[PDB]
Amino acid sequence: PXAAIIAA
Numbered sequence: 001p002x003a004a005i006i007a008a
């Protein structure tokens with residue numbers, strides 16, 4: 001979930 005936010 002933390003990577004999801006950063007990538008987005």
Ligand SMILES: [Cl-]
Nearest residue numbers: 005006007008
């Ligand atoms: Cl961006």
